[PDB]
Structures are given as C-alpha cells and as structure tokens.
Design a protein around this nucleic acid. Structure first.
Length: 213
DNA sequence: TGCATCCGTGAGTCGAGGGTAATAAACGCAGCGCGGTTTCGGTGGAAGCCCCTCGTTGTTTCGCCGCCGTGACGAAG
C-alpha cells in the first residue's frame, strides 16, 4: 500500500533491502539522482542507498530535506556506518540493511502515518527573509536575517565567529572577515535603541545571544 | 817452515702458519697463615625536634579583539 522510490544504481531493490519483497509495498527504482525526485509521483516514502558511501547518501537526504512539503526521506546504511547517521541528515527515519519485514512495516506506518514560537520581540517570517522587532518594518540582508535567526533559536547559547560562520554563511569559509563585526554592528543598529541587549558580545568568547529579561 | 786439516762463517724479499715425552715412596713433625669462630662498638641510618627561604596582592600597561564606521567590489533582479 506504499510506493517506495529507491534512488540506487543496483538496478534491483533486492540487495538494497532484502526483506521488502516480503511486504506487498510497491517499489519503483531509479539511479541516485536528484532529477529522479521529479520521478516521484504518488510515492509515500523514499529510500536512499548509503551502505558503502555515507557522503552522497547523506547529501541526497539533505537534497530532499528542507524542500518541503515533504514526503519523508529514508536511507539504508551499514551498522558500522551508523556513526554518521544523525539528525543533521534531515532524516525522518533511518533503516539498516538487516531490519525485518514487520520492522520496516512499523517504521513506514509510523512515519507516513503549527505556528512559530511567540515571542522574543523578534518574529521570524520565512517568506521575504526578514523579521519584526517591536515594529512591522525590519530589513535584513541575505545574511543579516539568518544571523538573527541563528541567535534567535539558540538564545543564550555561546557561538564563536567560526561556529557562527559555517551555519550563518554557507560557509566557504573566508578569513580575516569581521563580517560578524560588520553584521552584529549592523544588526545592533537596525534593531533600534531597544533590543540592543539581545546579543551577548563579551571579548573573545564569540557572539552569544542574551534573551530577556 | 810448510802443510795438511778442521772450521766458522753465509747461503732471498717474502705469504701458507698454534702444542709433541717420564719413574719403586711414604710417615711424621712444625710453622703455619687462611679461614672457621667470638666480643661490643659507636656511627652509622632512622626518629623526633626548632629558624629562616619562597608564594598573595596591587598595580601597569601594551596588547588585542570586539565595535564602529567606510568603501567597494561585489550580488541579485
């Protein structure tokens, strides 16, 4: 009753997951391509092969992730390869290549079968990449909107420039930037006289966010 | 005087390269100095006991990282 779409170059679903033939779910196969995500129709779940290669499997799990709406993404890895399997893959469920038929059935029937938190005086709207600080208008540049976003949810957490750099930027990451200094100085300006006490900037500890009061 | 007759010499620079033999013995005593042995000893290595060498604060100050703004070369439509 589920259409499972395999992105695997094995040309058969059998060595990727052996016991799946014991369940009468339909399996539609294609090589591990992003364009075969356009090959998804009424697929209820999707399995990626990452048994020997954790990197492209994790990135494909990432390629699916955050796109929306979304159909939940699954992957199959090895047991010594479960070290890299984490929440950073964008997984909803991970499968091993030795999980049983009723086990895969239960994981599938679990996974295929609200608003933002208010409020730290900085609302986050995901549409135009902008916020709202005690006032409707709040212009945030491409990276001056996520810098506040990064310090928003991790309020109270201490983050160094590089720790911020690789999540706030791509990052590349360049050096000798002061881009944090350029931003936080700018992010402490468009926030008006009030809420200047939203970021904790003590010397050489990085740039932590201080939540009220 | 000869005159034979022994005789005292040397006769290769150098490499290959360790060794082979014999007759009648016992007792006993003395010194003996090497090695069993037999004393305490104070100076040895602990055990317990007191004056002086090494750690707190009180600044100083270059240094440096956050900040602050500038400008442009970039970034996206």
């Amino acid at each position: 009753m589920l259409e499972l779409l395999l992105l695997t170059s094995e040309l058969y679903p059998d060595p990727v997951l052996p016991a799946l033939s014991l369940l009468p779910h339909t399996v539609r196969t294609a090589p591990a391509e992003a364009s075969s995500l356009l090959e998804a129709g009424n697929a209820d779940a999707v399995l990626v092969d990452a048994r020997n290669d954790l990197s492209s499997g994790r990135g494909l799990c990432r390629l699916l992730s955050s796109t929306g709406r979304s159909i939940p993404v699954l992957a199959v890895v090895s047991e010594g390869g479960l070290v890299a399997v984490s929440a950073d893959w964008g997984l909803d469920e991970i499968l091993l290549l030795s999980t049983g038929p009723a086990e895969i059935d239960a994981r599938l029937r679990l996974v295929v079968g609200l608003g933002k938190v208010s409020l730290g005086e900085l609302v986050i709207d995901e549409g135009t990449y902008t916020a709202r600080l005690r006032g409707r208008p709040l212009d945030l540049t491409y990276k001056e909107f996520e810098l506040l976003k990064y310090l928003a949810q991790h309020a109270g957490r201490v983050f160094t420039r590089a720790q911020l750099l690789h999540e706030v930027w791509g990052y590349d990451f360049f050096g000798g930037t002061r881009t944090v200094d350029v931003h936080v100085r700018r992010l402490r300006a468009k926030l008006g006289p009030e809420h200047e006490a939203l970021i904790g900037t003590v010397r050489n500890v990085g740039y932590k966010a201080v939540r009220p009061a």
